[PDB]
Write a protein that binds this ligand. Structure first.
Ligand SMILES: O=S(=O)(Nc1cc(-c2cccs2)nn1-c1ccc(F)cc1)c1cccc(F)c1
Lengths: 271, 271
């Protein structure tokens, strides 16, 4: 029935609202110009990053990293820091997808281990336009041009994310669309090392129906939006592997030692 | 509110199950006999020790050298290596404590630096009785009388931990209880060198509330269990200073030792 599916959508949308403070609708308002006053600090070069570093830390010692370092490395350390933060919120949201917490604990951990990245890059798209990305819970805004100009390995780092966001943001999805999408990702029965594949696919199967009904109702004028959205999941799988490859060059060719015990061991045997 | 507090307990218990392979329930299964996979090998003297290592026929050891040193020192190498894994386990668990990864980064490190030893002893109690301790994932069992008999410096290393364990275990706490108690330890605002005390105390306070309710509901006949458990926090703190004092003696009585890089940071200027 339709009402069951719609009830599952409403249910997901409210968890997602509990789990993620900066939503797409809020982020989009900020990126445009809703009630222009609390404007984010715009970082567009090195000087304005240093000037900004002391306006998201000059308050009271809470940045995404301290100093005594090269700027291209510090930006990258701040991003790994935020990712660990975002893994916690994704885990919290997962627990509220019906059926998830009744899976075998190891399969829970595996699902999260490979889902988290695709979700991070999906949701990061809500903070981006073609020119930059909202940072620090929407406090800052770092321009795509500035990220591009960092040195050889750090420059080409966030570009692929921006290439994705633009094509994905053109689907015009909202938070209620994304909440299901995100849940269809977590319950991917094709992750390596999964013990019980059948029950996961039973869940995804019921989320797919929910997604499909959601898109058909919320976006009737968009022929085959469901299909296009499932195809975007190849693009995500792609950006993850390509990010994974770039990440396995950073720890390989660099001088900075300071990586999070969580990601560095969760990146282990990962595509 | 009592629902969030129960939600926090199940949350922490799951992260506990996920981070620590040898739980209290399992350890007490191996100690009890209520298991289905051979009783552990008892080590009580030099010959049973010899054999317990020489038990390499269908039973393995963890990646490093073999009999490289003296007996007393080879146990010392054994525990050291296990510490490093405990630390990694504890770190993994820490990142899942609501509000921990949002903390200033230096603060995070400080909390882990001082909290780890306390958690290592609390959880080492789970594998103890008055007679000895499970070693190497509970495949082995080394007697307290054995550990007492070692050469001067080394024979006083685990005796303090034993005395604590017998009283702690009398509290009859379970894994669901330990999970919140451990979180309370890590989020301590009196660790030297912290930069944002208040946000740490706020979390502890909420964890304190959680633990109280967990104890009331899980041990309703146990009068003042909460107080009795917080009191054990001073016993633990004494174990650590004691342990760190024994390290000093090892610098004077031993030749080349030198600790694992990770452990050496955690001990650095530690009281
Ligand atoms: O915290 S410990 O008590 N540490 C410890 C005990 C011992 C020895 C016992 C008997 C002879 S030596 N050594 N260590 C130890 C741990 C870490 C270090 F960096 C140095 C010593 C311990 C004991 C058993 C298992 C553990 F995981 C930790």
């Amino acid at each position: 029935e339709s009402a069951d599916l719609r009830a599952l959508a409403k249910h997901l949308y409210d968890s997602y609202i509990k789990s993620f403070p900066l939503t797409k609708a809020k982020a989009r308002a900020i990126l445009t110009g809703k009630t222009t006053d609390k404007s984010p600090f715009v970082i567009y070069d090195m000087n304005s990053l240093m000037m900004g570093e002391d306006k998201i830390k000059f308050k009271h010692i809470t940045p995404l990293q301290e100093q005594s370092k090269e700027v291209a490395i510090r930006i990258f350390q701040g991003c790994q820091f935020r990712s660990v933060e975002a893994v916690q919120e994704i885990t919290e949201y997962a627990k509220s997808i019906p059926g998830f917490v009744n899976l075998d604990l190891n399969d829970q951990v595996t699902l999260l281990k490979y889902g988290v990245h695709e979700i991070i890059y999906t949701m990061l798209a809500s903070l981006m336009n073609k020119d930059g990305v909202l940072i620090s819970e929407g406090q800052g805004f770092m321009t795509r041009e500035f990220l591009k100009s960092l040195r050889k390995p750090f420059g080409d780092f966030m570009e692929p994310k921006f290439e994705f966001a633009v094509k994905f943001n053109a689907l015009e999805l909202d938070d209620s669309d994304l909440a299901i999408f995100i849940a269809v990702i977590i319950l991917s029965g094709d992750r390596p090392g999964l013990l019980n594949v059948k029950p996961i696919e039973d869940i995804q199967d019921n989320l797919l129906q929910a997604l499909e009904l959601q898109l058909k109702l919320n976006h009737p004028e968009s022929s085959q939006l469901f299909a296009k959205l499932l195809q975007k999941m190849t693009d995500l799988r792609q950006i993850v592997t390509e990010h994974v490859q770039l990440l396995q060059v950073i720890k390989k060719t660099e001088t900075d030692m300071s990586l999070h015990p969580l990601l560095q061991e969760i990146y282990k045997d990962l595509y």
